[PDB]
Amino acid sequence: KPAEVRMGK
Amino acid sequence: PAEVRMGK
Amino acid sequence: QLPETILGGLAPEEFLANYWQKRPLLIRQALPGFRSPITPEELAGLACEEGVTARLILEKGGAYPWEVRYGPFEPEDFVALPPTHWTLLVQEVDRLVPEVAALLETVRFVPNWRLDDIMVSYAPEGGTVGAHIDNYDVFLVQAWGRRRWQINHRPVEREELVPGLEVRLLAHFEPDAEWILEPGDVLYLPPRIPHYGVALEDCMTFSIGFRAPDQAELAEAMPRMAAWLDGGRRYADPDLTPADEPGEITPEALDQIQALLRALIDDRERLARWFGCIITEPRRGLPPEPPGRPLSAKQLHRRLQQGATLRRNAIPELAYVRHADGSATLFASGEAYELSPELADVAPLLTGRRPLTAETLRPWLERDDFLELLQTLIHSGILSLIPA
Amino acid sequence: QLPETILGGLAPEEFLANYWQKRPLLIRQALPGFRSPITPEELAGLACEEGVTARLILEKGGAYPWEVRYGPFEPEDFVALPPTHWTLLVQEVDRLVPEVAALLETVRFVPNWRLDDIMVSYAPEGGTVGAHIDNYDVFLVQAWGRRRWQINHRPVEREELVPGLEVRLLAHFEPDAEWILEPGDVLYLPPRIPHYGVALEDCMTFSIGFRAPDQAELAEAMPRMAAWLDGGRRYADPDLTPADEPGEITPEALDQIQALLRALIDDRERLARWFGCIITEPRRGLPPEPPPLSAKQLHRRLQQGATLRRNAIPELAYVRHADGSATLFASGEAYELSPELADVAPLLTGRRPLTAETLRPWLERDDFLELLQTLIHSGILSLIP
Ligand SMILES: O=C(O)CNC(=O)C(=O)O
Ligand SMILES: O=C(O)CNC(=O)C(=O)O
Ligand SMILES: [Mn+2]
Ligand SMILES: [Mn+2]
C-alpha cells in the first residue's frame, strides 16, 4: 500500500 | 468513568 | 441440559412485545438445574490469562473505598483479598469457555449482532459493584449462591453520578422492587434500569449482555469504510469562481461534502458490508486463533462425512446480509466473506441456530467453493470441528 | 517584491475558468526575478529539525534503486551521499519559514481550506523523484538551478505502478511535452497529470500544493463528529419480532443505522463545525507554538505600530450560519463567534493585512480582545512590531 509522492507523512 | 458492563 | 430459550414459560413473541427494551422481568427457574460450568477457582485462573479483560472491585478493605484493580492478574493478587465485600468480573467468558457459550444458545430470538458477550462475576458475601445503570439489555443469570437484586422500574434519563470513583455509581438510588435469586432463575433488565446486586453468599452471576450502537460509536467506526473505497469520489471544483473571501467555507462546498458522505451512507450494499464488519469485529483484546494446519478439502469432506460436527466459537461475531442482486456477504469476526447467489443460501445455515452436521450440510457438501469456505473459516478460527 | 497574484498576465477568473482542474499551464517568469529565501544548506539543516517531515530519495547510489530514507535527519546523513542522482524533500516549509508563507499570498483566489502546504525540494545534477502522479493541484515553482519537466496532457485513470518501490512511480510514461524551467518560472498541473522532473544542476523547487478530500479520507475523519455528540441517539428495537435466521442483519436494522448516520450528516450546523475543524487540523506532526500579553498592552502595542501575522493560512477558515453567527476555525479548533462580531472572521482569514488601521472597529470591544489573546496564545497569530 505505497503512498503518493506529494503526500509525505 | 467507564460504563460498568462495557468492560474495556 | 438446557431448554430451547431462556424465557421459561413465556413465548418469544410475548416477551419481545411486552418487555424487550420496555419493562424489567424476573423469570423464576428459567434454567432448571443450571449450575455454573466453571468454578470460582477456574474463573480466577481465567482472569490470569493475558489478553483477557478482568476487574477486581473492593467496596471496602482496599487501599481506598471502591478500589478498582485491572487485569490480567496473577495468583498473588487473589490471596490478599479480604474474606468479604469484593467482586471479580471477567469479560467475554463465552468466547473462552464453550460450556458458557452454550448458554448463549438459549437466547437466539434476538439477532446475533445485538449480542455482546457473557460476563461472569464471582463474589463472596456482601460483594457488589454498587448501584448503577447500563445502556445494555441484559439477562442476569444466577449460576451459584444467592444474590439480592434491587431495581427501580423507572429508567434513568439523566444519570447523576458520584464524582471520581473509577466505577459508575448513582448518587441517589431508591429501589421500588427487590428479589433474591437462586441458581436457575433469571432477571431481565432493559437499558438504563438502575440495579443494585449484593451477594448473600459465595455467588456467581452470568450476565448475558446485548449492545446497540449510538451515533458516536458509528461515527468512530466510519474509517473502516475506506477498505471498500480505494479513494472513491474526490471533491472537485473546476467551476470555482474566485474567492470573495478566501477564508469562507461556502455553503456550496458543504453541499458537495454532504453529497460525498451521503453517497457512502446511501449505498445500501456498501453500508451493509461496512456495518456487518465493524459490528462483528472483536471489541476487546481477544480475537480467535487458527488451529493446527489447514484440513484439506478432501479431509474436510471425509471427516465431516464420518460424523464430525462443526461448532460456532463466537456467535455474537457471526452475521450475514442478503443483497439486491441475490449475492450475500457473511461476516465473521470483522472479516467479510462474499457469497455468490447460488452459494448465498449457506449464510443463514452457518450463522443460524441449527447444528452443523453432515445431515444439515448435505446440499452444499459436494460443492468445492463451499469446502473452500469452510477451510478458510476453520483456518481463521471462526468454526471448530469436533468428532463424535 | 511579489506580484499581487501568480498567473503571469492572466487574471484569476480566466485561470479558474480554463485551466484549474482541467489542463496544465506553463507560466514563464510568473515571479519576475526571485530566489529562495532559504538556501540548499539551510533547507538541509531544516530537514534535521525535530518534528519536520522530510524525505531523502536516492534514484541511484543508494543501497538499492529508488531508496527512501525518512527524516528527521542529522548532518551525518548529508556527508555520505553521491554528488548526483538523489533528491531531498521537505514538507510544510510555509509553516516553518514566514518568508515562504509570503509566497502563499499569491494564490489567494482559492479558498484557504483548499490549501495544504508548500513543500520545498532540492536536487543536485541528475537528481529526480521520478515519473508519477498526484491528486493535488500543484504550482511547481522553480527557485534555483534548472529542472527538466516532462508531462502528458491527458489525466490518468488507471495507475500503472512499479512493484514494491516505497514510492508511487509510473511503470509506463510517454511524455508529450518537455520544458526547462529556470528560476521564476512556474508550472501548474491539475490533478492526476503525470510529470517527470529531472535536475540539470543544483536546483530547488517550491511546490505549492492544493488538496481536496475524497470519500475515504472524509470517512476516516468522521470520528471527530463523536466529539460534538456525547453519545447521540442510540439504536433501539422495542418493536423487534422474533428472529427467523438470527444471523441476519435485516433491512429494517440497516434502515436505522442509515437513519442514525444521516441525522448526523444532514445537520448543517454540525457538519460545518466538524468539517471546518478536520480540514484545518494539522495534517502531519508539526503543530503551532506560543510564547503572554495583556489586553491593555496588546491594544497599545498594536496602536504603537505593530502587526498581526497569519502563521498558517491553510489552517485558517470560517463558516457563516443562518442566524448571523459564525464559527472560526484555527488549526483544528472551533471558536464560536456571536453575530455581533461575526464579521471579524473574514477579516482575520482574508487577504488584507491585520493592522491598527484595519482592526480599528473592533479594537474597543472586550470579547474581540479575548479572542485575539486566545489566538496569539494558541499560536495562530504572531504579533510583529
Ligand atoms: O520537487 C520535485 O522535483 C517533485 N515534486 C512534485 O512532483 C510535486 O510537486 O508534487
Ligand atoms: O455481577 C455483578 O455482581 C454485577 N453485574 C451486573 O450488574 C451486570 O450484569 O452488568
Ligand atoms: Mn449492570
Ligand atoms: Mn508531483
Give me the residue from C247, C276, C353 closest to D316, CB to CB: C247
- Please work out whether the CB of residue D91 comes within 6 Å of at least one atom of ligand 1: no
Residue-range domains of chain D with CATH: 1-212 (2.60.120.650), 213-385 (3.40.366.30)
Query: What number of residues does chain D have?
Result: 385
What is the C-alpha to C-alpha distance for residues C343 and C383, in angstroms, rounded to an integer? 18
Q: Cell numbers of D224, please?
A: 471527530
Read off φ and ψ for residue C264, nearest 5 degrees. Answer: -65, -55
Q: Which ligand is nearest to the CA of C139?
A: 2
Q: Cell numbers of D3, please?
A: 506580484
- Please work out whether the CB of residue D121 comes within 6 Å of at least one atom of ligand 1: yes
By the 8 A CB rule, do D373 and D304 touch?
A: no
Q: Is C132 marked as a binding-site residue? A: yes
Q: Cell numbers of C41, please?
A: 477457582
Q: Cell numbers of D314, please?
A: 491553510
Residues on chain C touching B3 (C-beta within 8 angstroms): 134-135, 168
Give me the residue from C214, C236, C242 closest to D21, CB to CB: C236
- Residue owning grid cell 447467489: C341
Residue D336: burial class (beta carbons within 10 Å; 0-12, 13-18, 19+): exposed
CA–centroid distance, D132 to ligand 4, in Å, is: 6
Q: Is C77 marked as a binding-site residue? A: no
Rg (CA), chain A: 6
Q: For ligand 1, pick from D118, D121, D135, D195 the residue to mutate: most ligand atoms within 8 Å of CB.
A: D121
Per the entry, the structure determination technique was X-ray
Residue D38: burial class (beta carbons within 10 Å; 0-12, 13-18, 19+): buried
What is the C-alpha to C-alpha distance for residues C360 and C352, in angstroms, rounded to an integer? 11
In this structure, the residues whose C-beta lies within 6 A of any atom of ligand 2 are B 4-5; C 87, 119, 121, 123, 129, 134, 138, 140, 195, 197, 205, 207
What is the C-alpha to C-alpha distance for residues D109 and C242, in angstroms, rounded to an integer? 5
Give me the residue from C20, C212, C229 closest to D215, CB to CB: C229
The CA dihedral of D45, D47, D48, D49, to the nearest 10 degrees, is: 100
Half-sphere exposure for D70 (CA within 13 Å, toward CB)? 8
Residues on chain A touching D133 (C-beta within 8 angstroms): 4
Give me the residue from B1, B6, B8 closest to C161, CB to CB: B1
The residue type of C7 is L
By the 8 A CB rule, do C87 and C128 touch?
A: yes
Q: For ligand 1, pick from D90, D107, D118, D119 the residue to mutate: most ligand atoms within 8 Å of CB.
A: D119
DSSP β-bridge partners for residue D329: D317, D334
Cβ distance C119 to B5 less than 8 Å, yes or no, reads yes
What is the C-alpha to C-alpha distance for residues C106 and C5, in angstroms, rounded to an integer? 4
Residues on chain C touching D222 (C-beta within 8 angstroms): 219-220, 222-223
Residues on chain D touching A6 (C-beta within 8 angstroms): 119, 134-136, 138, 207, 209
Residues C279-304, buried b or exposed e (16+ Cβ, 10 A)? bbeebeebebeeeeeebeeeebbeeb
Chains B and D are in contact, defined as 3 or more C-beta pairs closer than 8 angstroms = no
Half-sphere exposure for D176 (CA within 13 Å, toward CB)? 7
Cβ distance C348 to D229 less than 8 Å, yes or no, reads no
CA–centroid distance, D316 to ligand 1, in Å, is: 25
Q: How far is CA C216 from CA D215, D261, D268, in A?
A: 19, 9, 17
DSSP string, C60-118: SSSSSTTEEEESS--THHHHTS-SSS-EEEES-GGGT-HHHHHHHTT--SS-GGGEEEE
Read off φ and ψ for residue D378, nearest 5 degrees. Answer: -90, -10
Residue D254: burial class (beta carbons within 10 Å; 0-12, 13-18, 19+): middle
What is the C-alpha to C-alpha distance for residues D115 and D135, in angstroms, rounded to an integer? 13
